[PDB]
Amino acid sequence: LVPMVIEQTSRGERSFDIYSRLLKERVIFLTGQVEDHMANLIVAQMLFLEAENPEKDIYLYINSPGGVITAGMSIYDTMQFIKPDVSTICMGQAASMGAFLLTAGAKGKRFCLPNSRVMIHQPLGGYQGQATDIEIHAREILKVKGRMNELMALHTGQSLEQIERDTERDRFLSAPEAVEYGLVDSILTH
Amino acid sequence: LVPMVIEQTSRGERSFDIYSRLLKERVIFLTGQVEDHMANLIVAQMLFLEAENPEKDIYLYINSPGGVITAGMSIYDTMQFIKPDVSTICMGQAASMGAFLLTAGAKGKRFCLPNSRVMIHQPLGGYQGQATDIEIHAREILKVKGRMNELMALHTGQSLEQIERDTERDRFLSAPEAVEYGLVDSILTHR
Amino acid sequence: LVPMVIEQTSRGERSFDIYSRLLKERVIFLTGQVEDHMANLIVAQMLFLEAENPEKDIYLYINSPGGVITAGMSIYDTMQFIKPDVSTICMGQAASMGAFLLTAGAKGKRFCLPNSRVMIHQPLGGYQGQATDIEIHAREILKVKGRMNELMALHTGQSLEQIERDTERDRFLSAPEAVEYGLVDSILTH
Amino acid sequence: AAVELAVKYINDRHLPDKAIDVIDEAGARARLMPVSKRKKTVNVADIESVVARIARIPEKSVSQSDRDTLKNLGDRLKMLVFGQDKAIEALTEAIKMARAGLGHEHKPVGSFLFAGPTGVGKTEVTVQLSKALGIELLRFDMSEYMERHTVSRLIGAPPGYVGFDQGGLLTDAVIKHPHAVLLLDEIEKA
């Protein structure tokens, strides 16, 4: 159940869901494992907000533990295309795709909470079967990692060699240390 | 099975759920194990209420038996970031996240009920796999525990060493005992 | 499905649910096993009614087979704190946290139906783990057990020693016996 | 001055006859009032007296007399009201702005929306402004005009429907006192 909040208007009060009223204020929330339906839902919200206002920033709260990589790419390609800068405020955990989504955020508007934690590791698409088919599948995952790492380094600016070395094994970064690494430009506290 | 209540507001009468009406008065309800899904509702309510009236103080009931550390922290950071003082009343039960969020309320505004039971234990996490991966994961759980004790000390005011001794093993604090510890303040008991 | 009832109001006809219509008359239904979510719902109904008219008396009907002791304590604390006298009508059955909340009702307004059957037993909680953990959890069950006897003896008016011996083993009390025991002031009369 | 003042204040009568009435009355009063003064000339002062008396108003229609009150309108108002001093400046300046003859001919003297929490004393400022400016007071409450069919009570019901004969209280009161101050309490509820 979602609480219904009335939004005062000159015509009169109209009841709306808590998420609905937040969307009216350019606030979009993200949570749960990334899914095609979930990714497409956040995509429709981004497009509607851009048409409503093409300048005001659209907030994007990421509190997800990671999900399918392919689903996440749709969100990333929709965020870059839209003219308004996305404010990727990380309010909690941020797995591989979680880190990728917040890093895609426009520079100068990315914020992080004091006690948030961003976990970055490599993608895992392990499949078992005939060696012939695995070759193409094996080639594909590296290409996504290379493409993601290339785009990731473009946003952050760190050396590609260092990023792959670190991303080979699971890495945990604190909110203070995250800004040092360049994941988030600033921290929001007050 | 959520009852409906009629609000005799100016120019009309509107029906809203029992939970929704209380949200109009800045009374958020936290119930059940904490998770990424339920946390978004509390965070959404806090942000929505701030826009409506930053001067007014938000309220927060805690009736949770535990939850996820990651999702719990989101409520803690959001609570502190919002200008409004967030009261922290505990109804029925408290836990690691219930007690961590209970002590984060503005000093003086936080209160506790007579029969509330507060349970404060260290974060528990389990990981399996390659030995090297567990070592990296092992460091993370230790750091999370360190971040919890220091933040808890700031509100409660107790030394880090004292809380660590109690936190290392399962602990239980009665409502009167909790006041001496500093987790909460006693209820007004005035009618 | 829940039937819908119409209210005769001068302004216009107002639709209502069977539960919501009775809620408008300060009537609460504590039906089903005691649970965190269901208990929290009852707490909100009590506060709502208190604000509307603290002078009026809030009615509570307890027909439940018992449940989580911790969740029930929430109902007990709010009931005393709220000025409205929380009448307690036990319909059909009562169990752990059913009888405790039945006795907790304001004196002079507690009642039991003629065929209602009460049941009072010691809390049954078990913990598994290392020996050190069982020692702390076991002690907590001793504290709450004693806390219920003390509060039950207060409303009931019986001696502390009598309650401990009776509560040690499950006891079923008929509605006439309940009046003698002290859990309710009198039985409802037509 | 006589012709201009009669149209501005004596709305009931037409210009050709009412104007002569003022001139005729001023001649009789200009001759009777002097006691050894021998003020044969008829200045603007005599015109103000007769128009006021025949218009049934408390000396409002006078020239060079209002300027004395306008000079210290806020001062004499501050002695009957305590607080909201900043509001007095906004209200008194707009009044003087309109009275200076620079306003618009197809708009009222001034439209204001007093906004403050209940009990501040906006009604007191109006009940004292009318006595100061020598104008009547019109008081209406929009709480009774929140329905769809009640809106016609202000302008009047249409022909062939209930409520047509007496007319509308708003237009009737305005025609009776075209110089009064219109007060509408709780306009937002309308």
Ligand SMILES: Nc1ncnc2c1ncn2[C@@H]1O[C@H](COP(=O)(O)OP(=O)(O)OP(O)(O)=S)[C@@H](O)[C@H]1O
């Ligand atoms: N600032 C004030 N100075 C002097 N008397 C005041 C003041 N405020 C209120 N009063 C007195 O209190 C009386 C009752 O207040 P009301 O005039 O009924 O208030 P109100 O008009 O409903 O309030 P608002 O804020 O304008 S909606 C007034 O008529 C005055 O006699």
